Amino acid sequence: RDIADTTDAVRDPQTLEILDITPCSFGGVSVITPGTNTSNQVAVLYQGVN
């Protein structure tokens, strides 16, 4: 568990090594569009993700 009660430290089901599991990676899709009448091309931004 963690502060948000989320999994952060994991006992290896087998040997005695220490495992770390994070949930699925994601992001926030934000689009940068001009006017529909003016143009049709869309550039997309990814929120806080390298």
Binding site: R1, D2, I3
Partner: protein, 50 residues
């Protein structure tokens, strides 16, 4: 291993306060650097022992 052979004197049981003993792990979960409040069976602090 049977009925007593008398000679059983009665010592006076002196009482001492258990300061901070009797605390254990209530769950088999792993939390890192938190402050968790729980409701469970415990020794009261500074309670007299026999």
């Amino acid at each position: 291993q049977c009925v007593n052979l008398t000679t059983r004197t009665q010592l006076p049981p002196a009482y001492t306060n258990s300061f901070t003993r009797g605390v254990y792990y209530p769950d088999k979960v792993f939390r890192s650097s938190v402050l968790h409040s729980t409701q469970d069976l415990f020794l009261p602090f500074f309670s007299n022992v026999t």
